[PDB]
Write a protein that binds this DNA or RNA. Structure first.
Ligand code: 3HE
Ligand code: MG
Ligand code: MG
Ligand code: MG
Ligand code: MG
Ligand code: MG
Ligand code: MG
Ligand code: MG
Ligand code: MG
Ligand code: MG
Ligand code: MG
Ligand code: MG
Ligand code: MG
Ligand code: MG
Ligand code: MG
Ligand code: MG
Ligand code: MG
Ligand code: MG
Ligand code: MG
Ligand code: MG
Ligand code: MG
Ligand code: MG
Ligand code: MG
Ligand code: MG
Ligand code: MG
Ligand code: MG
Ligand code: MG
Ligand code: MG
Ligand code: MG
Ligand code: MG
Ligand code: MG
Ligand code: MG
Ligand code: MG
Ligand code: MG
Ligand code: MG
Ligand code: MG
Ligand code: MG
Ligand code: MG
Ligand code: MG
Ligand code: MG
Ligand code: MG
Ligand code: MG
Ligand code: MG
Ligand code: MG
Ligand code: MG
Ligand code: MG
Ligand code: MG
Ligand code: MG
Ligand code: MG
Ligand code: MG
Ligand code: MG
Ligand code: MG
Ligand code: MG
Ligand code: MG
Ligand code: MG
Ligand code: MG
Ligand code: MG
Ligand code: MG
Ligand code: MG
Ligand code: MG
Ligand code: MG
Ligand code: MG
Ligand code: MG
Ligand code: MG
Ligand code: MG
Ligand code: MG
Ligand code: MG
Ligand code: MG
Ligand code: MG
Ligand code: MG
Ligand code: MG
Ligand code: MG
Ligand code: MG
Ligand code: MG
Ligand code: MG
Ligand code: MG
Ligand code: MG
Ligand code: MG
Ligand code: MG
Ligand code: MG
Ligand code: MG
Ligand code: MG
Ligand code: MG
Ligand code: MG
Ligand code: MG
Ligand code: MG
Ligand code: MG
Ligand code: MG
Ligand code: MG
Ligand code: MG
Ligand code: MG
Ligand code: MG
Ligand code: MG
Ligand code: MG
Length: 245
RNA sequence: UGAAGCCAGAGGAAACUCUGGUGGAGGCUCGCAGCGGUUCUGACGUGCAAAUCGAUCGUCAAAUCUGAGCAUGGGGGCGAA
RNA sequence: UUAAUUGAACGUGGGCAUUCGAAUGUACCAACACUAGUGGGCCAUUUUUGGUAAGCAGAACUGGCGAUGCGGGAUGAACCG
RNA sequence: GUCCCACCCAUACCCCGCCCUCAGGGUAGAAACGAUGCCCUGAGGAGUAGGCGGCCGUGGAGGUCAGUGACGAAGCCUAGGGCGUGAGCCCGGGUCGAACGGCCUCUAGUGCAGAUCUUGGUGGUAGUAGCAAAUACUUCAAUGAGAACUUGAAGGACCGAAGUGGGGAAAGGUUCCAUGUGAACAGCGGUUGGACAUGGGUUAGUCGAUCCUAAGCCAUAGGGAAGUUCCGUUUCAAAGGGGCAGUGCCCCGUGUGGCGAAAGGGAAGCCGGUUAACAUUCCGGCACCUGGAUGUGGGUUUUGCGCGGCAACGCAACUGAACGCGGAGACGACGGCGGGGGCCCCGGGCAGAGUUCUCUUUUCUUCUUAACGGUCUAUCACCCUGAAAACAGUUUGUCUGGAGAUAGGGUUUAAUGGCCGGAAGAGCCCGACACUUCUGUCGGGUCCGGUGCGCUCUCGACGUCCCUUGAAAAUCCGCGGGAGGGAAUAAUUCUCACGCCAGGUCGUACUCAUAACCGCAGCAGGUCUCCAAGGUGAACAGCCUCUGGUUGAUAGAACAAUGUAGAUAAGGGAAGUCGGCAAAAUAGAUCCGUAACUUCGGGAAAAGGAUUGGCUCUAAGGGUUGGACAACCAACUUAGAACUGGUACGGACAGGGGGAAUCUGACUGUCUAAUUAAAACAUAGCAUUGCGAUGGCCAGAAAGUGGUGUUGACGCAAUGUGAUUUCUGCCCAGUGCUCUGAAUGUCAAAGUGAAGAAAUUCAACCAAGCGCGGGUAAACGGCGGGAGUAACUAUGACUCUCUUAAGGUAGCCAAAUGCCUCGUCAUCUAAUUAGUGACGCGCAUGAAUGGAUUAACGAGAUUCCCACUGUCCCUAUCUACUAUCUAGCGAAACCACAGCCAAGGGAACGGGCUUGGCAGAAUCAGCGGGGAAAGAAGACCCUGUUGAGCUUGACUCUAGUUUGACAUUGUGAAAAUUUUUUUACUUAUUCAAUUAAGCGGGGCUGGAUUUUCGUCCAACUUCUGGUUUUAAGGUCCUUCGCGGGCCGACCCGGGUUGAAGACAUUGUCAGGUGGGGAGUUUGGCUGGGGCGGCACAUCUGUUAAACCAUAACGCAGGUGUCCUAAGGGGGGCUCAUGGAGAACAGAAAUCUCCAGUAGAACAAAAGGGUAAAAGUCCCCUUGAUUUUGAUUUUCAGUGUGAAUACAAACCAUGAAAGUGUGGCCUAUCGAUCCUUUAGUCCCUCGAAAUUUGAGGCUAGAGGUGCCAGAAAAGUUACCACAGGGAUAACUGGCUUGUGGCGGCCAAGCGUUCAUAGCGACGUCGCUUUUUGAUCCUUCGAUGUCGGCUCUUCCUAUCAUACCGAAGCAGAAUUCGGUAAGCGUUGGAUUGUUCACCCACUAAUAGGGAACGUGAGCUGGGUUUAGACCGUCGUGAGACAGGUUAGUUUUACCCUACUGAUGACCUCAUCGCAAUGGUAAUUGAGCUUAGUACGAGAGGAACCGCUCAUUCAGAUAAUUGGU
């Protein structure tokens, strides 16, 4: 046969992300002396919409402690933030919504967002609309914190990893039906070229593992081994189980 | 054609319910150009034309149409298939 | 080989002559080398198998057409001369 | 039928002549000869494939002819001649002008009729097809040889502003303009031209490019790659940019390139005039921007950098360094509203033109004001006073207001607004005179209002939509900051006015299309955009007109058929047809009325009605200024009423047919460009799967490489189903996926141990995988039989049994899924294989391979009803353009030669042959029977040791991935020098962050800590949308300076900071996985192939026709084994059976006698053979051994298998003769290579020797059953090539089982009676309208069903004519004879042939003509490609299973036919008639007659009239149509 559709996606050139309207990426400011021992204060100048994301962004302005300049930086806004709010980031920052604190200085049971797996990786976990990370417990003997991820998985990260108190803004987005092929089309038009999807079972054998036959059907099981050879993975890859839950 | 929102009046004990306006929403509707190409299985079929012409027809505020610049190159691309 | 110079096989020396042991013909002496084309066949008298039968399918002997004209069967690849 | 005479003629026979071939003789003291000759004799003569011999011809080479030739070589033409059997040679005549030939050898690119041969040229067709879309031209004159398509004037028309107009972008390139023109081109002409020839033509500081960046591309640093080069665009880089006087000295630095838009961003030009061709470009006037210099005036300043206002802010200036902050550039779509420019519209006035029988103070035209410099206003908004409920202000739209509204007073962004300048001096319009041209002069004027849901552009404030929020950069400006500098006698802002200089380079013409672009072209196609008048009208709808532009497309004459386009038709109204295909009908606006169903939104324009013109009126709906008023303006909309008319009025144009249902998809949307627009795809909704970044999915040869990702589970990635409602059942055995392994199995390389001299071997251990075990079906998928049973019968709630992983649950159904099947019942109709509603043991329905139901929607499929109609009964008529004739111009396909038939034979359907019929020049218009007409080396089928696409558990591999080992790979500790395990370290390696900014240790400050002095933690910043920078100061020096050092700001270590860490990673091997990918294969025979079978290696009998040989998918069978005896020898005996007899005992037990030719046995099929044996029992043995030869059968006299007779050993047996080299004989089986064994006291390892190891020679075994021996799965309905009529599917040909039809006999039936009418059991035929059988023709194609239309033929006669017979009284009916003259229907269902009904009828007979008839139609079916379902398959896919959508080409050629002319015999009129054609048909009323006949019922016919059905010819008084 020929190269199937999911194989062509890795080359790009029509499958790359559309990012003309996307300005500077959403991430914390680089860890520095001010945040490691103390705190620094910033002002939420304005809350903006970032195409293809679904959660609003907030541009916060800080003061450079060395150069007499204002460092612009785009965070991910939480439910409650507003323009003119003062944002405090550091070890000694107060525990309020929108403040950026190390996870080791935050009590168990809290709710944080934009958690970083590694110290300095400026934001990795809990960044979509209604998602958040819960601090399960501490372990100060070696400086490690046990968190719970939006997927329901527990994980242990460094107690020096940062995070923003609260819940990401825009929650409940996926609770409204799109109702229209347009609404799906406009949703993906600013993200990438992945809509619509033709069904593989409706293709020809040259095009897909499912194609062909005098009836539209899958000849073999839709469950595909974990180590299939890059062109066989056209189903439920490495399914521990199938069927209705 | 007439969705939210808004104005006035009426009925009821209340819950609330009616009437007349205003408003101008919708991958709404008739329909011209554009776009397409259902039927006549019409014309032509050494044609005007290596796919056109006539009537009839589908859509017509949008998943509509479109120019230029750019990208994807052959067991490769691209495909609402 | 035999009981055996008894046999078996092959011979020397003699005898039988061209009537040398039926007819007819010899208008086919024998051997060798190298090589071509061919390796779809078909028809008929007689015999004969399968089949209801076939201008059907398959065999035996012989003769023909293929490769072949000529006179006859008006006409015809095979019939008659 | 037979007999007898004579005669005719074949290439045969006889004689003779001649040619050639073959054979046999003669020919030298040569007077003797192309001796390769001559003379004599005899016989013979066909020929494809093929073989051989001799000769002829062509281009060249050597020799020779003392060769020919300008007094004419070669070539060419020549119904002139000679020679040869022939290929050929020679000569004469004509043309021509320079070379050529014979003979002997040598040599070769050496001989053409074909190859759908190649190249070039030329025909018939043929003066033929044709030059027919876009409404259309006519008169006069000039030019000219010539005028329909040149020009001027006049008339008539068209485009009708989304144009046939005026400009451009792309593209083209001189097509632009003038002058001239022979040919060619402009498919007719041409004086004309986008043609040809010669010249000319494009002027920019202001337009565009140039500048910026976007998507993206390419350098640099680096890293890969054998390399061409790939990645990389800010990285793991010592990257750059400015100041002061070719160098010196300073300051900053986070970061350091280019290309990429003539539509994006952007400094700045307008008006008038001017050329044959340019204009925002030239000329005149009047401006603007940028850059650089620099003067005057003005402004500021003698305590140095302006004043005014409460404020919003203002003014002509009014310092401002580094650094920083902000704005502009800079942004979506849509809606109504308001302002402005332009256009349109309505008045009045000044001028001009048109009309003027009459009328119209009338109809039409001009009445203009640019950039730029000011000045005065224009929405929002903001400021001051003040403080609101009785809430107020306020928009078309409901927003604002104690966060300050109303009100009053102000500030300000915004001009395409008014006024002034520009500027009337311009332009324009009139009138009067100049003039030879130069085109000259003069005068007057160039005005004032209104209206609007008007159109277009633009601006502004609001509003709506988004899980959609709708570019960036160059560049410019403002502010914060306060560096430096700056006068009191002159400096200074050169953000004020004026003054000075300069603005480089390239493009610039023209078309922008029914003739300048692309399509082979001057092609009805395609190609981006701006401006957009009047009327009607809702309207850039259609129709007509103005400005502007065309009048270009071969023309003239007639008006035949058939056409194409436009139409109309009486009565009926789908009866036509597969089907209402096509057409008709409805249609605007206002008022009324509107159902089921429903997701409550719709359906809905449901359905269905009424009105509509003109004229005269009336009323309502406003604005402005002055206090329920008065006066002056305004243009549209609505409503009411009289009158009126041939009751007509959306009068043209424009403009929905509707309803009741079924199947299917929810809807909007999309695709097979050029046969399928769909039920297919998509979609929202639902569900499942993977993944927490050292990750998931994917790319790359590799990479310090990349996409998702400027991403982080409400995300990305992979799938299935397909809105809503209601549900989504059971099964984990099979195949997949997944999880754990404690586990015992299998188990690679490396490593370990043992043996050995070593190579090497062996053993243990042994990762992943497999195996084992669990889960998983919204994973792939699957979801049963048999029997009995209820008080009529029937059925089976119930029971029994086999069996599965589970046995189909809820639902649904002859459904797009049901064969039987046209299922059964009901409804629909007169009639229904159609539709609908039910039923259900459902071949083969069924639940996200989704089940059921669904409102709305559908160029989807289907049925019915109403309306409507030429679909039809049944045709007719009209118009335009063709066809037709003419002038001009002028092809192509096709073509062996050609063109009359009947029959015969023939390769089985002839134009040619044979026998007949016949047959008379040359033609024109039609036509579609034939030329098995043309188009294409059949696309169906088969063959090929020909492919390709796709699939998979085919064979062989492979990228990738997983696991193990070794290297990278280092340093310690702990237990059990080194083993395995754990643990620790950083420097290798890896990852991340950052402008490498603050790390580790200590000190200082504080508190609880034991207060051990000596322990742990902190150490500036948290009511607010402000600011933070170019250090203040302390101390020491100093030129006494915002000068210099240290501190301010603790010391030390130079590890930038974290994570991971000898594990990842990387390199090399090894095991697994791996249709993701690659290569290849997928036997043969065969009454076509596939399925079936094995007739593929072999044996017996028969076919087989008396030696042997001999075929078929002929007949009846067999083999792939079995046996230490069932082999070998010897001896004794006789078997199967029958009779008779003996206790249990009998039909069968064992014993005895007699008879018993084999009727038994001999392993196994059958056939031979055998009796003191070849059978049976007993005794002894291994001849079933060794050595090679000869022979036989199949046969090539090869192999294999098998067999025969000897010879030489060693044996066995017997007293011996003898016999024994497997089985009584005919079947019982296997090469090369490789491996292994036995033997060879053997040979070799090639520098020498020994021992292992290896290789040799002779003989076996391991096996090829496709058996003389390849290692091998499918599908193609997406398909391809070489071929085949060696071979199927359709016609024809032979045959006739089968189908159909007809005879003979006579058992019976018929009241009795074989034969009125039938006729069983038998039996003989005929036809080719059924289907078979066969495979002769056609595979470089004969268009393959039916229907429609039309002609003709047959008889085996349904009706009609005339007759015979009857179980014929009449009537009706049945059988038969002549006879094919003449008829044999309209419909429902089905594509149907057929069938089955309704109805009429004299009757509703059967057939043929290539299953008549596709250059006659249609395309319903069949019969490609799309799609759905059921069953089957793991899958790709298959299905004479069911559905839906799917391009039907060419006549002008010859003949045939239909008509029409026509030469010759002088012209003409009037006639004859050979021959050819021939045409009529049937029924009903009255009378006969209620009569004959007959017991009633019933019930005729002949004659004679009167009409009507079908058919035929003609006609236009009447009616109807046109
Ligand atoms: C089947 C097995 C193998 C066979 C033999 O090795 C086959 C060879 C044949 C030869 O021609 N070359 C081929 O490549 C393989 C042998 O004879 C059999 C007994 C046993
Ligand atoms: Mg498909
Ligand atoms: Mg595949
Ligand atoms: Mg399909
Ligand atoms: Mg349209
Ligand atoms: Mg069309
Ligand atoms: Mg057509
Ligand atoms: Mg034609
Ligand atoms: Mg575009
Ligand atoms: Mg041979
Ligand atoms: Mg032959
Ligand atoms: Mg002969
Ligand atoms: Mg002789
Ligand atoms: Mg001559
Ligand atoms: Mg000369
Ligand atoms: Mg040659
Ligand atoms: Mg030649
Ligand atoms: Mg030739
Ligand atoms: Mg030829
Ligand atoms: Mg003509
Ligand atoms: Mg034409
Ligand atoms: Mg327009
Ligand atoms: Mg234009
Ligand atoms: Mg010109
Ligand atoms: Mg011409
Ligand atoms: Mg001419
Ligand atoms: Mg590069
Ligand atoms: Mg550039
Ligand atoms: Mg540009
Ligand atoms: Mg011009
Ligand atoms: Mg000028
Ligand atoms: Mg001042
Ligand atoms: Mg901006
Ligand atoms: Mg823009
Ligand atoms: Mg002015
Ligand atoms: Mg200007
Ligand atoms: Mg202005
Ligand atoms: Mg517009
Ligand atoms: Mg120009
Ligand atoms: Mg121009
Ligand atoms: Mg131009
Ligand atoms: Mg134009
Ligand atoms: Mg062209
Ligand atoms: Mg071309
Ligand atoms: Mg109007
Ligand atoms: Mg109009
Ligand atoms: Mg024309
Ligand atoms: Mg009919
Ligand atoms: Mg198509
Ligand atoms: Mg179509
Ligand atoms: Mg679908
Ligand atoms: Mg091993
Ligand atoms: Mg294991
Ligand atoms: Mg199913
Ligand atoms: Mg004939
Ligand atoms: Mg012929
Ligand atoms: Mg002849
Ligand atoms: Mg003849
Ligand atoms: Mg014909
Ligand atoms: Mg014709
Ligand atoms: Mg043909
Ligand atoms: Mg062929
Ligand atoms: Mg073969
Ligand atoms: Mg192949
Ligand atoms: Mg395999
Ligand atoms: Mg750092
Ligand atoms: Mg393959
Ligand atoms: Mg075969
Ligand atoms: Mg055979
Ligand atoms: Mg014999
Ligand atoms: Mg014996
Ligand atoms: Mg032999
Ligand atoms: Mg012996
Ligand atoms: Mg024996
Ligand atoms: Mg062997
Ligand atoms: Mg063989
Ligand atoms: Mg095929
Ligand atoms: Mg097939
Ligand atoms: Mg057949
Ligand atoms: Mg018969
Ligand atoms: Mg045949
Ligand atoms: Mg044949
Ligand atoms: Mg054929
Ligand atoms: Mg042919
Ligand atoms: Mg034909
Ligand atoms: Mg007869
Ligand atoms: Mg027939
Ligand atoms: Mg025909
Ligand atoms: Mg099909
Ligand atoms: Mg299946
Ligand atoms: Mg089929
Ligand atoms: Mg006659
Ligand atoms: Mg008539
Ligand atoms: Mg009349």
């Amino acid at each position: 046969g020929r190269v199937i559709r999911n194989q062509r996606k890795g080359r790009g050139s029509i499958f790359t992300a559309n990012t003309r309207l996307n300005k500077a990426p959403a991430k914390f400011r680089s860890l520095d002396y001010a945040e490691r021992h103390g705190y620094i204060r910033g002002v939420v100048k304005e809350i903006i919409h970032d195409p293809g994301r679904g959660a609003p962004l907030a541009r916060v302005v800080f003061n450079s402690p060395y150069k007499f300049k204002k460092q612009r930086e785009t965070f991910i806004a939480n439910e409650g933030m507003y323009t003119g709010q003062f944002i405090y980031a550091g070890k000694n920052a107060a525990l309020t919504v929108g403040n950026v604190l190390p996870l080791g200085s935050v009590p168990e049971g809290t709710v944080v967002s934009n958690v970083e797996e590694k110290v300095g990786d400026r934001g990795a976990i809990g960044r979509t609309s209604g998602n958040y990370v819960t601090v399960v417990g501490h372990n100060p003997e070696e400086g490690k914190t046990r968190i719970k991820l939006p997927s329901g998985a527990k994980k242990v990260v460094s107690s020096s990893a940062r995070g923003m108190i609260g819940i990401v803004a825009g929650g409940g987005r996926t609770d409204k039906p799109l109702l229209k092929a347009s609404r799906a089309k406009h949703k993906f038009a600013v993200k990438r070229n992945s809509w619509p999807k033709t069904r593989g079972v409706a293709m020809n054998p040259v095009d897909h593992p499912h194609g062909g036959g005098n009836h539209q059907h899958i000849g073999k099981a839709s469950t595909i081994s974990r180590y299939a050879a890059q062109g066989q993975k056209a189903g439920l890859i490495a399914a521990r189980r199938t069927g209705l839950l």
